[PDB]
Amino acid sequence: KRPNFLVIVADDLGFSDIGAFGGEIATPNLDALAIAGLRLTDFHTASAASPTRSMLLTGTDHHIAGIGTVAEALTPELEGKPGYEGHLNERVVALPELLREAGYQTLMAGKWHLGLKPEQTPHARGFERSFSLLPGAANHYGFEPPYDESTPRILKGTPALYVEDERYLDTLPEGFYSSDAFGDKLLQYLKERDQSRPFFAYLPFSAPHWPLQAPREIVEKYRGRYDAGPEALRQERLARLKELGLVEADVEAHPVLALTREWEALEDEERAKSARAMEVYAAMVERMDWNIGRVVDYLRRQGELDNTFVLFMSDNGAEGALLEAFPKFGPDLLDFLDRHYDNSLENIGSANSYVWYGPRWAQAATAPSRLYKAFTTQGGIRVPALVRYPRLSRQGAISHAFATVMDVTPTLLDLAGVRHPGKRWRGREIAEPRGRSWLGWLSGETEAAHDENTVTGWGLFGMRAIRQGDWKAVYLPAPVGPATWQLYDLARDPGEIHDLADSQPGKLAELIEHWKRYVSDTGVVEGASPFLVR
Ligand SMILES: [NH3+]OP(=O)(O)c1ccccc1
Ligand SMILES: O=P(O)(O)c1ccccc1
Numbered sequence: 001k002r003p004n005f006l007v008i009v010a011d012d013l014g015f016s017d018i019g020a021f022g023g024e025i026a027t028p029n030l031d032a033l034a035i036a037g038l039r040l041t042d043f044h045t046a047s048a049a050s051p052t053r054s055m056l057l058t059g060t061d062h063h064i065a066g067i068g069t070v071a072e073a074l075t076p077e078l079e080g081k082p083g084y085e086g087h088l089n090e091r092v093v094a095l096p097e098l099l100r101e102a103g104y105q106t107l108m109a110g111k112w113h114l115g116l117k118p119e120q121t122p123h124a125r126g127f128e129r130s131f132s133l134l135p136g137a138a139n140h141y142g143f144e145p146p147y148d149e150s151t152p153r154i155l156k157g158t159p160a161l162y163v164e165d166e167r168y169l170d171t172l173p174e175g176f177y178s179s180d181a182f183g184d185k186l187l188q189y190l191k192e193r194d195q196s197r198p199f200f201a202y203l204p205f206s207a208p209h210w211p212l213q214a215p216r217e218i219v220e221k222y223r224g225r226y227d228a229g230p231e232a233l234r235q236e237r238l239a240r241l242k243e244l245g246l247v248e249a250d251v252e253a254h255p256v257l258a259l260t261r262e263w264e265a266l267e268d269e270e271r272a273k274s275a276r277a278m279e280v281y282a283a284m285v286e287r288m289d290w291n292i293g294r295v296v297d298y299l300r301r302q303g304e305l306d307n308t309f310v311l312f313m314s315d316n317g318a319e320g321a322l323l324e325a326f327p328k329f330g331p332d333l334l335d336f337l338d339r340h341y342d343n344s345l346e347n348i349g350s351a352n353s354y355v356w357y358g359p360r361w362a363q364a365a366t367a368p369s370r371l372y373k374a375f376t377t378q379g380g381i382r383v384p385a386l387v388r389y390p391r392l393s394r395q396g397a398i399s400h401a402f403a404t405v406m407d408v409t410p411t412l413l414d415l416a417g418v419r420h421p422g423k424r425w426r427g428r429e430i431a432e433p434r435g436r437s438w439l440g441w442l443s444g445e446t447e448a449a450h451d452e453n454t455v456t457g458w459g460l461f462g463m464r465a466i467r468q469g470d471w472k473a474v475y476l477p478a479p480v481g482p483a484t485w486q487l488y489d490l491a492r493d494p495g496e497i498h499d500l501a502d503s504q505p506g507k508l509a510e511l512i513e514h515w516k517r518y519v520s521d522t523g524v525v526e527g528a529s530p531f532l533v534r
């Protein structure tokens with residue numbers, strides 16, 4: 001029998017947040033899947049949400065698939081460039097499109113982030129049933145601010161714009177909470193399915209993405225848990241990562257970089273509200289996990305779970321952004337929030353709060369990696385991932401084999417017994433996957449799907465990375481780095497601390513040749529101004 005697929009994507013979830021990845025957050029459902037299955041410590045996405053999602057559903061690079069940069073920040077020199085359409089384009093065929101023509105029922109409940117228009121919806125791109133938030137974010141409870149000319153651009157670009165199949169929804173149900181709605185709808189779709197054929201179920205949550213909001217009864221369970229702050233947390237996470245074997249005992253963690261005040265410099269009220277945000281984040285993750293459990297438990301009781309290839313991943317590094325630091329997200333984001341939301345301590349986490357936890361809490365979760373979401377350093381692109389599928393021999397272990405989100409489409413096609421159509425589909429020229437099927441690796445035939453010569457590129461917001469085997473070069477422009485290529489031996493220096501550019505100049509040179517080919521193969525275009533902070 002052909003397996004089902006359950007692909008679950010967390011939004012900005014950090015590497016050590018889940019219990020089985022070193023965390024204190026209650027994630028019993030995910031833990032059971034992770035420990036029975038295979039946990040990946042060297043699995044990679046892109047550095048941000050829509051690029052990663054375009055890659056996950058195609059098996060190629062986001063510069064080819066239509067999200068060369070995030071739609072919400074297209075500049076004039078980028079608009080019109082191929083692969084910079086801002087939605088999943090027609091130079092690619094999506095995974096669900098291919099599975100649906102081979103008898104799979106394609107079911108989705110969650111965030112899309114691959115296009116806002118009718119012809120760009122899940123329904124248009126191969127899902128027979130879908131309940132979706134089309135934008136990159138929204139209020140989890142559906143509470144909208146006033147929308148007019150003076151509304152901060154980041155809020156304007158994150159309305160609660162939901163579709164069910166072809167229908168743009170006019171209202172949301174009472175009690176709507178994103179993660180619960182997604183669990184509800186996917187459970188409905190599964191209970192309504194044709195039980196005699198397999199399903200591809202896509203469960204992209206919007207949690208734990210800002211605004212940080214969760215049911216009070218779950219937030220209450222974390223009361224006081226984070227009082228010692230984000231650096232105390234980082235140490236707990238490092239200790240546990242080492243104890244669990246997820247990182248080597250000796251690893252040197254990258255130093256925490258933030259323009260904010262450190263915990264001990266904060267006044268009591270400020271601390272209280274920052275801890276409250278992390279208590280809410282934790283509740284988001286636990287409630288996500290709970291909804292995952294509802295899905296998995298239904299499949300299990302149906303006797304289908306063991307014939308379901310279950311993949312869980314985050315879509316990028318933990319979110320260390322200060323939304324208030326980007327003029328593009330304004331004008332006056334904090335002033336608008338102060339006049340429309342209540343972020344007083346007691347309200348944080350409810351529908352009419354709007355918070356993000358910032359760079360220090362984010363780096364607790366990405367440690368020992370460098371930085372966080374929207375950087376090309378490991379903090380931005382190395383994400384937690386697990387595969388639970390008991391037909392595959394390689395289960396019960398922690399694997400440090402290199403893998404990327406582009407591997408997923410070819411793996412699932414393989415298992416479905418479906419061939420990628422090649423260079424043409426529905427009469428148009430399409431890209432072929434850049435990833436490689438994990439089947440050989442996971443079946444124990446090989447030690448990894450890739451090898452010491454595998455070459456993989458990243459480029460977004462003017463940052464770059466280029467990796468071959470365990471050698472990685474990184475380029476971070478001003479003001480966030482030296483605007484020169486830095487070179488790291490990831491096997492000896494996972495924290496990207498010791499720049500080897502001067503000691504191994506031959507190796508850097510090769511990587512720069514690889515980078516140029518990447519730019520060439522994928523259509524990378526960098527603009528003047530990577531971004532502006534202020
Ligand atoms: N790479 O180190 P740890 O031993 O987790 C540490 C302790 C104190 C400060 C920084 C790092
Ligand atoms: O890249 P993100 O998913 O963080 C994003 C960007 C713009 C609007 C909403 C979400």
Ligand SMILES: [Ca+2]
Binds near residue numbers: 048315316
């Ligand atoms: Ca994300």
